């Protein structure tokens, strides 16, 4: 089930990634220009976070964990409108991802865990038997000495 939820999250990520990249790609800056010749969301002062789709995707992923600072949403030229739209898009992403989707996963996982719990033992024992059976066989020696 988690996998299914992930597909939806991915789609949202792609969407916001495309959008953000679409707005900030006009304001990409050179690594040399950037302090300490460091460019990306993994530098002391995060920079050029939404400049490229690859970077935008990374930035949005790390945002899910709060490791993306908010100052990354401002362009140096300081075009107020753009920055605001950018921050608003980033914010909406955060809400959709953390407040909504993430929470929904909790609900879904709670529903299943409940059901799975009903047949937990049979499942475990079937699995255990399979394991025990594997060893019940005769073709078996440890891996280091497995090969002559």
Ligand X SMILES: CCCCCCCC/C=C\CCCCCCCC(=O)OC[C@H](CO)OC(=O)CCCCCCCCCCCCCCC
Ligand Y SMILES: CC(C)CCC[C@@H](C)[C@H]1CC[C@H]2[C@@H]3CC=C4C[C@@H](OC(=O)CCC(=O)O)CC[C@]4(C)[C@H]3CC[C@]12C
127 contributes a contact to ligand Y by CB under 6 A: no
CA-to-CA distance for 24 and 16, rounded, in angstroms?
12
- Residue 40's DSSP bridge partners are 47
Q: Which listed residue (1, 11, 84, 120) binds ligand Y by CB under 6 A?
A: 11
What is the DSSP annotation of 55-111?
HHHHHHHHHTTT-S-GGGG--TT--HHHHHHHHHHHHHHHIIIIIIIIHHHHHHHHH
- Looking at beta carbons only, is 44 or 138 nearer to ligand X? 44
The binder of 97, among its own copies, ligand X, ligand Y, none, by C-beta within 5 to 8 A per type, is ligand X
x-or-dash string of contact with its own copies, 88-127, rule CB under 8 A: -x-x--x---xxx-xxxxxxxxxxxxx--x-x-xxx-xx-
Dig out the tokens for 106 from the structure.
Answer: 């909790």
The binder of 36, among ligand Y, ligand X, its own copies, none, by C-beta within 5 to 8 A per type, is none
Residue 16: how many CB atoms within 10 A of its CB? 22
42 contributes a contact to its own copies by CB under 8 A: yes
- The contact set with ligand Y (CB under 6 A) reads 7, 10-11, 14
């Amino acid at each position: 089930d988690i996998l299914k939820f992930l597909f939806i999250y991915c789609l949202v990520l792609l969407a916001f990634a495309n959008g953000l990249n679409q707005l900030y790609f006009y304001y990409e800056t050179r690594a040399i220009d950037e302090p300490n010749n460091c460019k990306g969301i993994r530098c002391e002062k995060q920079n050029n976070a939404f400049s490229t789709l690859f970077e935008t995707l990374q930035s949005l992923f790390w945002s899910v964990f709060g490791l993306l600072n908010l100052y990354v949403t401002n362009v140096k030229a300081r075009h107020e409108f753009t920055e605001f739209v950018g921050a608003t898009m980033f914010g909406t992403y955060n809400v959709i991802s953390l407040v909504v989707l993430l929470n929904m996963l909790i609900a879904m996982m709670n529903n299943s865990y409940q059901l799975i719990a009903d047949h937990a033992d049979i499942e475990w024992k079937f699995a255990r038997t399979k394991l025990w059976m594997s060893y019940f066989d005769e073709g078996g020696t440890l891996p280091p000495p497995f090969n002559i």
